[PDB]
Amino acid sequence: MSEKLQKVLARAGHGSRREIESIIEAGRVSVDGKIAKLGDRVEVTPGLKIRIDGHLISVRESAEQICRVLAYYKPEGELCTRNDPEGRPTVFDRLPKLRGARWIAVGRLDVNTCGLLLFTTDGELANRLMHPSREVEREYAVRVFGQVDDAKLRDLSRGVQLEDGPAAFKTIKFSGGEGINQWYNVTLTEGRNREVRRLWEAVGVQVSRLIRVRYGDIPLPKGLPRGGWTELDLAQTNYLRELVELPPETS
RNA sequence: AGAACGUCGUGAGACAGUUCG
């Protein structure tokens, strides 16, 4: 009943897992006064003393960790990265400051794509939401141009061959016309690169606009400005946890 | 082949990884 040291320290807000591995590898991290090595595990208990460069780090048990969730209306022009080699804007730039924890992005969006991005302090929740084993729904509003008929919708639902293998939309619903364009709401239960655009392209349809409008049981909040965040309340956080079989928080 | 982040994993490697660039 233990965890890799870098998992614990990342949860505590002291860097990413792999960043922390570098610090461990450099002999800078100790447990109970003894230098830790890469791969070491610890069991968080009240008296455990983990230090980085001699400085004590306050840590928490995994199951008792802070589980906050934000809904963010990700705007075009921001990257889903914590460290862009080129220094371009990121989705983390305006999120509220946290100590003793950090925001984890639940998946990524393309820079030029708008829509809902969840963040959470709880990396178990994050992975359970992202990993396709639990088949969490991602819903997009898609504006397309091209011939579409029920046969095409059938093909997209039953599986088409993409460059990186078979893929299918889980649901597809016509949501309205506009000009020489139609809107559809579609869902996927995985998240391959540009998958929504590439599915439509595979059946000869081009995508002019693409907005992520729901992740799991959390819709893009009504009235949330583009580029704005809002924090989910306890009930909503618990609903999201329950979706991926995590127990509810009481706080 | 340029990166990020989670999750497993005494470090060798992994995921039904994530709409990265």
Author numbering: 1 to 251
Pull text from the paper:
Here we address the question of how two homologous E. coli Ψ synthases, RluB and RluF, selectively modify adjacent bases on a stem-loop of E. coli 23S rRNA. RluB is specific for U2605 whereas RluF is selective for U2604, but also modifies U2605 to a small extent. RluB (1–251) is comprised of an N-terminal S4 domain (residues 1–60) connected by a flexible linker to a catalytic domain (residues 66–251).
Escherichia coli RluB (1–251) was co-crystallized with a 21-mer RNA stem-loop identical in sequence to the target stem-loop in 23S rRNA except that U2605 was modified to 5-FU to block the last step in catalysis. The 21-mer RNA stem-loop binds with the target base 5-FU2605 flipped out into the active site cleft and the loop region abutting the S4 domain. The target nucleotide, U2605, is flipped into the active site of the enzyme and RluB has turned over 5-FU2605 to give rise to the C1′-C5 glycoside bond typical for Ψ; RluB (1–251) is catalytically active against the 21-mer. The second RluB–RNA complex is statistically disordered at this site indicating a mixture of covalent and non-covalent complexes. RluB stabilizes the bulge with a repertoire of hydrogen bonds involving side chains of His131, Ser133, Glu135 and Arg138, and flips out U2605 into the active site.
